[model samples]
Target: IINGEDCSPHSQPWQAALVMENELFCSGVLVHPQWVLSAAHCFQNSYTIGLGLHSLEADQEPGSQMVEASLSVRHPEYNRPLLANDLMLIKLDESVSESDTIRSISIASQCPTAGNSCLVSGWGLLANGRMPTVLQCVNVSVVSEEVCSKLYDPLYHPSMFCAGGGQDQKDSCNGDSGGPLICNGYLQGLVSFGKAPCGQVGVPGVYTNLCKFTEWIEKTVQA
Candidate 1:
């Protein structure tokens, strides 16, 4: 969440923090009572999904649950080198009870329109790679696939999309991988990767387009 502002408590109820070895390494979204959606590349070890989290350095508010990842399924075509199909689903060991601060977000049924408004949140870097204790958020507009292709050729696939890193100072950075890229109250994408030294204009952050893998997600969750 480079160059972003602090987020409100429960503002992003579906947001989840992927804690590996008790440290927040990535972000995620609760897509179901027992399923979390995140970036496949973010997982280096076993992780716990901290749902309804706002502050990482303090005691979590009531209703927040720390769910263990019982299983993780990465996209079959996910390539670590090329970062293709950088999506993952973490099945919770047990189902969680939804509350005011804990809930599931709806997935988008279609791709986002170019230039549509979106929001990205995380407890990632602030600026200059400094980490933050509180959650941060930024409003970003979706970039057209054609324009994104121009900036990143051969890397931008139809399964991916871009947001922010345009004229605005907002851009997702380290510790933000796997966070939600919400558009029109729907989860449209998941934070995947971006150029180093983030928040640079004309270098939008890359994300895995959820709409492109809805069928897979539905099948996996059902399985």
Candidate 2:
């Protein structure tokens, strides 16, 4: 996260760290006890997901649970070129035990409109490219899709939405892809893509809109 502040301990209970070979690669969200929501482009297989994580340095928190994930169900219509429908769900080997610092978040049923504010949390690189040990968070205001299209041009697809980066240029970096965008305690968006050297004026971070895939998610979970 760029130009962000460290989140309070265990405040983001649904946060999930997608680890690849012990390296923090991406962020995810706990949607169900056995399912994690993330981006389709974030390597859909073989990951160790850290749930209820706060500090990367000391992971012995009471609610921390490192679970193995081997299967992922990416959106059937995920467009590789445009990165449309860039969403996925990873199946945990076992269901996580619910606790105050570990639980699933409710998915947004209605799409968030412009001017809606939200919170984004992740352990991504800072503006200076330094990674953070503790999860960082930043407030973002959702922008109109029309403005985003003009700023990003053909690269911005209908399936994607933009937030933040209007005035101060606060944003999310690549490592934060698949991270949750919480709007009023509901899972609203997933960090999907961003411009190079993130946090640029008029170039907000792109996210996968959960409102566009609620039915798909429910169907997949039931399958």
Candidate 3:
């Protein structure tokens, strides 16, 4: 979250922090007992999936789980140069046992309408370069693709969508990439990318539109 407030402890159970080596690298969403959804751009050989988390400190809550990624599958059509289809499926080493602070969220079947409001949670760095210990959240409204395209122009991709900015001005930023964009109880998008120095008043952050990849997700997961 670029400039959001701290979220209540374990309030967003599906949130996953992707830690590379020993540092928080990105965010993710728990979509199944053993599967996570994240941005393809965040992919690596592996990562420690920190779940049921509200804080980034050591000795997390007892209910929290630290699963390792057993497999990583980036969407076949993921175009690095264009940053299109920026989604990935991460298979955890084992199915996480659900608890009060651990759960999975269903993916949205379609994109939300332009005015739909959604929430995004993460522990990304503050514009000041400090990483927040507690998770942050903010409400953002879905913006039309046309408005986003106009703002980002040549950088916008069809596989991506826009949300937040304008008067609300809330947006996702680096390190928050791969986190969930939840709308109406469904996982609508994954934090893809955003403008530099984040929280720009009129430049909404970009997200990987999960609605367009529902079929691919199901196929990949069931295979």
lDDT (C-alpha, whole model) for all candidates = 0.86, 0.88, 0.87
lDDT of 3: 0.87
Each prediction's TM-score against the native? Answer: 0.95, 0.96, 0.95
Residue pairs clashing in model 3 are: none
Query: Best candidate, lDDT-wise?
Result: 2
For model 3, where is the 10-residue window of minimal lDDT? 56-65
Kindly list the per-residue Cα lDDT of model 3 for residues 17-71, writing each as its tens digit: 8987778989999999989999998888977998887887548576788888769
Determine the C-alpha RMSD for candidate 3 after optimal superposition of all C-alphas: 1.4
Instruction: Summing lDDT over every window of 10 consecutive residues in candidate 2, give the lowest-scoring window.
Output: 55-64
Per-residue lDDT for 138 in model 3?
A: 90
lDDT tens digits, residue span 98-217, model 2: 999898998998897888999999988986789888899998999987888898788787778899977777899978999999998899999988888888887789899899899999
Clashing pairs in 1: none
Q: Candidate 1 — which residues are off by over 4 angstroms?
A: 57-60
Model 1 residue 207 lDDT?
92
Error of 1 at 193 (Å): 0.7
